[PDB]
Design a protein around this ligand. Sequence first.
Ligand SMILES: NC(=O)C1=CN([C@@H]2O[C@H](COP(=O)(O)OP(=O)(O)OC[C@H]3O[C@@H](n4cnc5c(N)ncnc54)[C@H](OP(=O)(O)O)[C@@H]3O)[C@@H](O)[C@H]2O)C=CC1
Ligand SMILES: CC[C@@H](C)/C(=C\c1coc2nc(N)nc(N)c12)c1ccccc1OC
Length: 186
Amino acid sequence: VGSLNCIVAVSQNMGIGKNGDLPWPPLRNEFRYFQRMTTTSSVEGKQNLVIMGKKTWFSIPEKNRPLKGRINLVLSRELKEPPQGAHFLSRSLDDALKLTEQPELANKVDMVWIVGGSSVYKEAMNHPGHLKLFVTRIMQDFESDTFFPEIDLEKYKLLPEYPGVLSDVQEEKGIKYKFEVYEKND
Ligand SMILES: NC(=O)C1=CN([C@@H]2O[C@H](COP(=O)(O)OP(=O)(O)OC[C@H]3O[C@@H](n4cnc5c(N)ncnc54)[C@H](OP(=O)(O)O)[C@@H]3O)[C@@H](O)[C@H]2O)C=CC1
Ligand SMILES: CC[C@@H](C)/C(=C\c1coc2nc(N)nc(N)c12)c1ccccc1OC
């Protein structure tokens, strides 16, 4: 099984969501980027796994439910089975990652991507070991009600570039944003 990775898009005031939707209007290529990063597996005959909280699952426009080409796992202590269209259900992040070692997934999974929400991000980021964060910096303030955790830069190093990730400023709908990759190993 491969790398552990978080991916997020976040505004200047640290916001990731407002009532189960994005703080900002739809950014079509930003979303294509998320799709490409999380889907693309190098290891042949494997798929990436995506791990999200229950809220995040239910915020997915149904058109993208499940996220195609990836194994979709939802985290919920309340649910008793994977939601309609999801593949797996775990009661915690540690369980999710363990499940990954079992024979049913042992060599189906390439990369695992945590795609939200706030408490999942915080736990993966605080989890010792080798981890990357793919962070789109939306370079405005947007009114939000859910927030990305603090990135501890003593631990997380911003990489000066990364294959397959544009290093320069993007703009959609008059909103500027840029793509960053942070890496820790502790
Ligand atoms: N990059 C971006 O801009 C992103 C934005 N979002 C947005 O934020 C929202 C979703 O984020 P958020 O509200 O933080 O919620 P989550 O997606 O984390 O969902 C929360 C629920 O999932 C369960 N859960 C969370 N963590 C764990 C865990 N470790 N183990 C077991 N269960 C867990 C709990 O469900 P239960 O009560 O059933 O146990 C919890 O109430 C949406 O608005 C979405 O649009 C989400 C991801 C990325
Ligand atoms: C897992 C859900 C994903 C489909 C999503 C957000 C992102 C999660 O990590 C992300 N990382 C990046 N770089 N961009 C994103 N957009 C997300 C999303 C959630 C609610 C409403 C609209 C959304 O996208 C239009």
